[PDB]
Structure 1
Amino acid sequence: GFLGAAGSTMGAASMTLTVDTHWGIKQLQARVLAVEHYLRDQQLLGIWGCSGKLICTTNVPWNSTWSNKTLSEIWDNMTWLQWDKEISNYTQIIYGLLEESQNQQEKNETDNLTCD
């Protein structure tokens, strides 16, 4: 269910993407933290132009240095846990590129040229 297919390959696992004072302070910290995490993820999908989607594609190409593997092995012979570890050192690079692409698209949409 919740983490169902966690040990399955990434391709297979795509099927589950659709799935008193001190006490007071701990409860407030837990609630505030949950909100902050929610908003950070929504903000990030928003800034990349993936708002409301589980599957989102972009205009950023995958770099040849980001594991240098083929799709026929990546999706079929690896799990998401393994994949996340395999490319973890490119996390910020990819996120930055996604933000740049989306911002450029938005700028193109309001150009004085075309648009009208």
Structure 2
Amino acid sequence: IFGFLGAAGSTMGAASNTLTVQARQLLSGIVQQQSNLPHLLQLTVWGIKQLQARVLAVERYLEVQKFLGLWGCSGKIICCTAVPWNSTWSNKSFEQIWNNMTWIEWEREISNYTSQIYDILTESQFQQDINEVDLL
């Protein structure tokens, strides 16, 4: 098994079996402890910076949840929807991707159309539900 970020350089396919370890560590941390011992410990410089950490912790988790909340499969690790490729964001075939290209490098290639990917993905989830309302 692998630990935190234990396969960031491994191939696409072999890095698809270590997703669960990183999902868990996205909020768990030592910041939960208030202080070793609680003058004015509330406004102490070591206290004002710690509070900033806790707020940044939830906002970083909430950011991912909100996007994954809208895409219609909240509460799952892996998930596929019904948006077919236009095949111009990445014109590479299957085995050429999942075998020998890596995750870190792959994001750079597609990082140029994500703002046009997140929006189009959300509309599909909304579109599916509209057809369902007038179905039954």
Task: Tell me whether 1:62 sits opposite 2:64 in the alignment.
Answer: no
Q: 2:18 aligns with which of 7, 16, 19?
A: 16
Which is higher, the Rg of structure 1 or of structure 2?
2
In the other structure, the counterpart of 1:47 is 70
TM-score, normalised relative to structure 1 = 0.91
TM-score in terms of structure 2 length: 0.78
Q: CA deviation at 1:102?
A: 0.5
Superposition deviation, residue 50 in structure 1? 2.3
1:34 equivalent in structure 2: 57
Where do 1:52-91 residues align within 5 Å? 52-91=75-114
Q: Would you say how many aligned residue pairs link Structure 1 and Structure 2? A: 113
Equivalent residue letter for 1:69 = K
* Cα displacement string for residues 56-111 of structure 1 (whole angstroms, at most 9, x for unaligned residues): 00111122111210011111111100111111101111101110001111222212
Counterpart of 1:55 in 2: which secondary structure? coil
Unaligned runs of 5+ residues in structure 2 are: 22-40
Q: Deviations over 1:30-76 (max 9, x none)?
A: 10111111111111111001211111001111221112100111111
> What displacement does 1:24 show?
2.2
Give the helix-richer structure, 1 or 2: 1
Q: What is the CA–CA distance in structure 1 between the aligned matches of 2:72 and 2:19, rounded to whole Å? A: 18
Separation in 1, partners of 2:132, 2:57? 35
TM-superposed deviation, 1:23: 2.3
d(CA) in 2 for partners of 1:105, 1:29: 40
* Matched AA of 2:93: T
RMSD: 1.1
Q: Which has the higher strand share?
A: 1
Which has the larger displacement, 78-87 or 15-24? 15-24
Q: Which runs of 4+ in 1 moved over 6 A?
A: none
Query: Which stretches in structure 1 are left out of the alignment for 5+ residues?
Result: none
Distance 2:101 2:73 in 1: 25
